[PDB]
């Protein structure tokens, strides 16, 4: 179901992201709740500071630590997860 | 036509933000081109590192430097501009 659009992040950290986002959707309906759930696992598992954008239509321009960015689709939802700060 | 939902930044930096989004929309259509224009201006004006999301349907959970975050609607889009790293 996952579709990785773009990434700069180890293939296993990526799987981790997608597992996390799958969990998040089993548990949360509305974008802000999903995002906050994904973000917090990653600060916890891979250290702060991470940022997550969840929605059905957005664009972005961000700066991320090298090797810590993932942008993907998990159905009609697009997830952006990256680390900066 | 700007409507400021949430913010943590000087009223004067909010105006600036909006003026910058306004300029961004006069010359860009594509959500990621809008975002990048704004992001790069704030890096220039207020130093790195900023992140900007431009979208009609998204949510997010991010961390930002105190006094440097704004989320607002302009036109038919929602803008998130914040600094982190």
């Amino acid at each position: 179901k996952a579709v990785i659009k773009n990434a700069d992040m180890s293939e296993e950290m990526q799987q981790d992201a997608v597992d996390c986002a799958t969990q998040a959707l089993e548990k949360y309906n509305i974008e802000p709740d999903i995002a906050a759930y994904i973000k917090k696992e990653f600060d916890k598992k891979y250290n702060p500071t991470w940022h997550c954008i969840v929605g059905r239509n957005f664009g972005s321009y961000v700066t991320h630590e090298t090797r810590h960015f993932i942008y993907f689709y998990l159905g009609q939802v697009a997830i952006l997860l990256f680390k900066s700060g | 036509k700007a409507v400021i939902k949430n913010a943590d930044m000087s009223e004067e930096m909010q105006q600036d933000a909006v003026d910058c989004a306004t300029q961004a929309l006069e010359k860009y259509n594509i959500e990621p081109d809008i975002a990048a224009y704004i992001k790069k201006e704030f890096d220039k004006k207020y130093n790195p590192t900023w992140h900007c999301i431009v979208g009609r349907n998204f949510g997010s959970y991010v961390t930002h430097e105190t006094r440097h975050f704004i989320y607002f609607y302009l036109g038919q889009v929602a803008i998130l501009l914040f600094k982190s790293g």
Partner: peptide, 9 residues
């Protein structure tokens, strides 16, 4: 250790 990237819907 940093990169700038755009995402598209």
């Amino acid at each position: 250790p940093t990169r700038d990237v755009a995402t598209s819907p």
